Write a structure and sequence with these properties.
The protein is mostly helical and 249 residues long. The chain has ten helices and two strands. It has two domains: 142 residues, Peroxidase, domain 1 (Orthogonal Bundle); 107 residues, Peroxidase, domain 2 (Orthogonal Bundle), CATH 1.10.420.10. Bound molecules: protoporphyrin IX containing FE and potassium ion (K). Keywords: Calcium, Heme, Hydrogen peroxide, Iron, Metal-binding, Oxidoreductase, Peroxidase, Potassium.
Length: 249
């Protein structure tokens, strides 16, 4: 259902150059997970009913999120601001989604297709809000399904975004990485989830909910056994997330 807008050749040129600059920057700064989180969270504010929120530049520097969990995203946007300034023609909305795509790529994940043309909207993110690490499967379907309009498969695949990065007790309160290789995009989120709790590693109640649900669980097993399949489903889900409300909601 996507009809992508036309952008000028100068715009496409900036996209390509920004993509390369983002690779080097994100790799050097070791901030892929924070950038993936910024992109996903920004896109994830979409609500299909009201057609509000989505990946439209609504969280930017200087951010004021202040609430538990969302802290850290202020750091992400500040980190990106000097580079963004080198590409004034790009919308913030496109720039942040491009950074999320690059974050997945430079850590070794799939190549998520990217289409430019998101407009920076006025304005802000209403919150309040939804995504709660202490809740379960019903809550997940409320957030991704009822609000965002994604499928059950997308929910499991996107949860695998936790295969890179960590929680911080000063940010959400949770603490530590999901995996032993938190800068490597692979299927280890699912293998660690299956094998139970382990010293040094984190599982949110929202991660654990995937294990108890009749639809989610077989997908967890599938992804833990077949990284290629995870990569395919992840690339599909990430593209959809990144394009919520955009080029036909
Ligand atoms: C399913 C609902 C989700 C919940 C409840 C949730 C919750 C959280 C929490 C509590 C943290 C820790 C924040 C901190 O303390 O620093 C976190 C981090 C993170 N999230 Fe999620 N998340 C969800 C979905 C997603 C999705 C869909 C993606 C991307 C596809 C994602 C990517 C990440 C990444 C990469 C980090 C690590 C950030 C870092 O290393 O600084 N999350 N998430
Ligand atoms: K990993």
């Amino acid at each position: 259902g996507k009809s992508y807008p036309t952008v000028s050749a100068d715009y496409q040129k900036a996209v390509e150059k920004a993509k390369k600059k983002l690779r080097g920057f994100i790799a050097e700064k070791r901030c892929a997970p924070l950038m993936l989180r910024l992109a996903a969270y920004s896109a994830g504010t979409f609500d299909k009913g009201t057609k509000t929120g989505g990946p439209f530049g609504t969280i930017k520097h200087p951010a004021e999120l202040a609430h538990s969990a969302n802290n850290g995203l202020d750091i992400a946007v500040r980190l990106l601001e000097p580079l963004k300034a080198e590409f004034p023609i790009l919308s913030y909305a496109d720039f942040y989604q491009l950074a999320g795509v690059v974050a997945v790529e430079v850590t070794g994940g799939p190549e998520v297709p990217f289409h430019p043309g998101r407009e920076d909207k006025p304005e802000p993110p209403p919150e309040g809000r939804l995504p709660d690490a202490t809740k379960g499967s019903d809550h997940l379907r409320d957030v991704f399904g009822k609000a965002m309009g994604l499928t059950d498969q997308d929910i499991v695949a996107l949860s695998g975004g936790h295969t890179i990065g960590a929680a911080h007790k000063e940010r959400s309160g949770f603490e530590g990485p999901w995996t032993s290789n938190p800068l490597i995009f692979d299927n280890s989120y699912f293998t660690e989830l299956l094998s139970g709790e382990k010293e040094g590693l984190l599982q949110l109640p929202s991660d654990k909910a995937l294990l108890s649900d009749p639809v989610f669980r077989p997908l967890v097993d599938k992804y833990a056994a077949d990284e290629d399949a995870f990569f395919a489903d992840y690339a599909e889900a990430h593209q959809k997330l990144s394009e919520l409300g955009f080029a036909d909601a």
